Amino acid sequence: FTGEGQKLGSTAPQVLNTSSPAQQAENEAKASSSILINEAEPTTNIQIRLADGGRLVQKFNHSHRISDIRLFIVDARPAMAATSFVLMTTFPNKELADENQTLKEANLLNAVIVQRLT
């Protein structure tokens, strides 16, 4: 009755920026540091498409796992740690299932991974 109302669509509720401006640098710091990069094993690069508003973080090492990315997301940001979601590649739109699956097996090599809250 005074305008500006957001509709109540069937899409899953959203998680905004729970981390303060300062907190998010330390939140990437963990992720960037947090997991293993052994230079003597050939690399790969991932670009995450979070639903947070269109937030994208990249990086990684040689052969790891899809679940390790799911771990990076949580490490890179607290809020999502409780939120349920899934992973993907767009334009064939394959749902990254079998969380363990290694990057080699999923063709997830240097390829963009989208995040969708269930």
Binding site: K7, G9, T11, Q14, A51, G54, R116
Partner: protein, 305 residues
Amino acid sequence: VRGGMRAVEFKVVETDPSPYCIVAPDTVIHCEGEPIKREDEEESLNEVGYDDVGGCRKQLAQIKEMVELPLRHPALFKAIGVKPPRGILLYGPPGTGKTLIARAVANETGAFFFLINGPEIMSKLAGESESNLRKAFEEAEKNAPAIIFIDELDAIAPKREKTHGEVERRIVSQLLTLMDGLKQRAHVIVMAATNRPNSIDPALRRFGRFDREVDIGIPDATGRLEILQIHTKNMKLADDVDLEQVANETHGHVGADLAALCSEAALQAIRKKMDLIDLEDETIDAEVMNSLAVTMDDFRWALSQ
């Protein structure tokens, strides 16, 4: 956007996060009443393109390179002494896609396209016919680069011994003259379609005329599949529809055949669900059409015709 047996064009009027944005599942979509106007430099995706031609790649490739320089780099031949092709002869049975190809090549290269139809020309009285002929070449040169397409050339210039009178042979003569006076700097390429060599008058092949020939025959199963997929892009096919199967029982059919074959299927679908399901009116519901799906049964029916 394709569907409901058609394709609608939509112009992004405004995006929230300004210049560009990714349409996420939470993105609010507004499409408030009104259909906007098509501007000048905005062609219709309903125009013919190379994606509307299937079963021709080899031939479509030859033609592309032939016209590539003359139509895309006119200036070149202005400063060159090399001679580009002028006339291209497209032979093959009817409904093979020659007209389609010629029109597709013109648009796809932004060239002016002028159409001459054999019967049209021959329906006129003799002097009028010539008049029209030179008019086509005249208008073509004014808007060059251009492609003049003579559809049903054999209707105008039949073989040496199909000549029947001062009027018949007077027109072919006119067409030959026009071809010899057609200079390079003009930037014109005249394409003509016929059923086969013998059909035409041998003189249209003299070196400065229709010197280049391209055979566009009947499609093979692979080719036929391509076409079927093109003429069903705008409809909803049941999951039991096997186009490849269709293409296999289609030897001998040409593009026009497949195109019609589809229409039959789609009509057989409508007749079934439209007839009894009160889906008729002095206008159509986009949704009603969008829901309707052509089953493999419909194609088995179209074939049995």
